[PDB]
């Protein structure tokens, strides 16, 4: 949909006590639907990590103006790919135990706990 390719985050990272980087420290490859959203906002790299996928999704919600109200309780969509990975019209932003669980079912990883295979595909500029 869109393209920028003018942003490289090194120190700026997103993490909280609920589900921190200690548990979500796995490499991800470009193929599923979850990482297809951040690939258009501003993420043109070979391979990303599970912790970096949360940073690219948070920047789009702040710049496009998704959550704007006095009493923060629930956010609304504006007819975009945001409601195609989760499959809901409205969701909670401060609830970290509801958004991370959905990201764990629609993605691919390199190192797994059980013996499983997915494929091999890389995209870069
Ligand atoms: O403190 C808070 O409760 C919110 C805070 C942290 C929040 C977050 C951090 C780590 C894991 C998760 Cl799941 C969520 C993070 C965020 C990141 C990604 C999404 Cl999809 C939704 C929210 N944002 C950026 C938001 C647009 C402004 C925050 O402002």
UniProtKB/Swiss-Prot annotation:
Domain annotation SWIB/MDM2: ranges: 26-109
Signal peptide residue numbers: none
Tissues showing expression: Ubiquitous. Isoform Mdm2-A, isoform Mdm2-B, isoform Mdm2-C, isoform Mdm2-D, isoform Mdm2-E, isoform Mdm2-F and isoform Mdm2-G are observed in a range of cancers but absent in normal tissues.
Posttranslational mods: Phosphorylated at multiple sites near the RING domain by ATM upon DNA damage; this promotes its ubiquitination and degradation, preventing p53/TP53 degradation. Autoubiquitination leads to proteasomal degradation; resulting in p53/TP53 activation it may be regulated by SFN. Also ubiquitinated by TRIM13. ATM-phosphorylated MDM2 is ubiquitinated by the SCF(FBXO31) complex in response to genotoxic stress, promoting its degradation and p53/TP53-mediated DNA damage response. Deubiquitinated by USP2 leads to its accumulation and increases deubiquitination and degradation of p53/TP53. Deubiquitinated by USP7 leading to its stabilization.
UniProt-annotated location(s): Nucleus, Nucleoplasm; Cytoplasm; Nucleus, Nucleolus; Nucleus
Extra remark beyond the main annotation: MDM2 RING finger mutations that failed to ubiquitinate p53 in vitro did not target p53 for degradation when expressed in cells.
Entry similarity comment: Belongs to the MDM2/MDM4 family.
This protein's name: E3 ubiquitin-protein ligase Mdm2
The species this protein was found in: Homo sapiens (Human)
Coverage span on the entire protein: 1 to 125 of 491
């Amino acid at each position: 949909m869109c393209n920028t390719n003018m942003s490289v985050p090194t120190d700026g990272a997103v993490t909280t006590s609920q589900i921190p980087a200690s548990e979500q420290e796995t490499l991800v490859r470009p193929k599923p639907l979850l990482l297809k959203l951040l690939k258009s906002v501003g993420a043109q790299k070979d391979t990303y990590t599970m912790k970096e996928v949360l940073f690219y999704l948070g920047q789009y919600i702040m710049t496009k103006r998704l959550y704007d109200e006095k009493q923060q309780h629930i956010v609304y969509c504006s007819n975009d790919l945001l409601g195609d990975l989760f499959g809901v019209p409205s969701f909670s932003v401060k609830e970290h135990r509801k958004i991370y669980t959905m990201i764990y079912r629609n993605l691919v990883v390199v190192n797994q706990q059980e013996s499983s295979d997915s494929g091999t595909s890389v995209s870069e500029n």
